[PDB]
């Protein structure tokens with residue numbers, strides 16, 4: 045029957061399957077859920093799908109439609125950012141994730157210094173994921189949300205199930221969802237709560253927002269923490285791994301730290317942290333390249349193939365931190381559903397790389413690359429541990 049998608053959980057190299065997709069930039073695949081989908085792999089056609097309102101994100105959660113994998117979340121939260129905007133909270137949300145809000149940029153530089161010094165004090169080797177990228181990501185999201193740093197562990201423990209890419213519903217996902225919601229409701233009335241959750245609590249009783257239940261405000265906190273932490277931890281872990289795989293680039297940034305912002309664009313382009321496709325349901329019959337896509341069919345945007353399309357990025361496998369169009373990568377999506385937290389994502393990664401170059405310039409892998417354990421059937425490619433020495 046059909047070519048199975050996805051291809052490999054290994055994040056050390058592009059799956060070999062990508063090369064054969066170049067002759068068939070729209071190809072029918074069988075998904076994890078066992079459903080047909082169109083896998084789109086050229087930069088031009090991926091951009092077209094992301095920018096065209098005939099390709100719906102919201103409709104991928106409708107009942108009975110072809111799926112990539114099973115939902116771990118209630119259906120209505122697939123269009124989270126739209127339910128957020130619709131409810132009048134967009135302003136509060138966009139403020140909390142702005143890296144210029146309440147000294148957030150200064151806090152990230154300061155806290156990254158603390159986490160790396162704690163690692164330096166213990167000596168090598170350490171698991172960089174467990175001891176740096178996890179807490180750096182989780183603590184950022186505790187600060188944004190206004191909840192205690194000490195609660196990061198209970199909320200992060202959910203994400204190993206929440207972002208699974210499973211053929212079947214997961215009983216653990218519903219139990220974790222209900223527990224994290226109940227926790228976030230408790231934070232609304234907690235006198236200690238600050239940040240986004242304190243601003244969301246304050247809207248209650250404001251006549252305009254009588255439609256906003258405690259569960260609905262709690263949904264904003266839970267989904268922001270989950271999406272934000274898995275994305276920042278996933279990307280940053282694999283951006284550092286890419287710098288370990290390209291020591292010449294690590295060395296360019298040691299001598300030229302002013303190039304770090306541009307280097308993060310080029311790492312967004314080549315990193316292999318995305319293990320799935322960006323899903324869209326066709327609202328209408330659309331010709332996409334050579335393929336007549338039918339109304340109600342599932343389309344998957346393959347970011348890692350788009351970002352290495354030589355038509356758009358000549359010499360695509362070269363990591364060039366001076367690449368003029370590095371910024372045109374699809375790793376933050378595009379069109380109506382473009383990541384709203386790109387300023388924070390970039391700044392978070394820039395600062396971590398800056399602090400590691402300054403305080404741990406001899407950073408290297410502590411194990412043979414083949415001894416990494418790649419997480420299977422998960423939305424991200426990540427090594428369970430990233431053992432490093434210096």
Ligand code: HEM
Pocket residue numbers: 101123124125126141268269271272273275276279322323374375376377378380381382383384385386388389390392
């Ligand atoms: C740091 C690296 C990050 C990466 C690589 C990343 C990547 C992405 C991508 C690819 C999408 C588009 C999904 C699609 O088109 O179907 C997206 C959307 C989104 N991201 Fe990010 N993201 C990052 C950080 C964050 C953070 C820190 C937050 C914090 C709250 C966040 C919240 C969201 C939300 C709510 C959406 C949905 C947008 C919508 O439906 O309009 N992201 N992200």
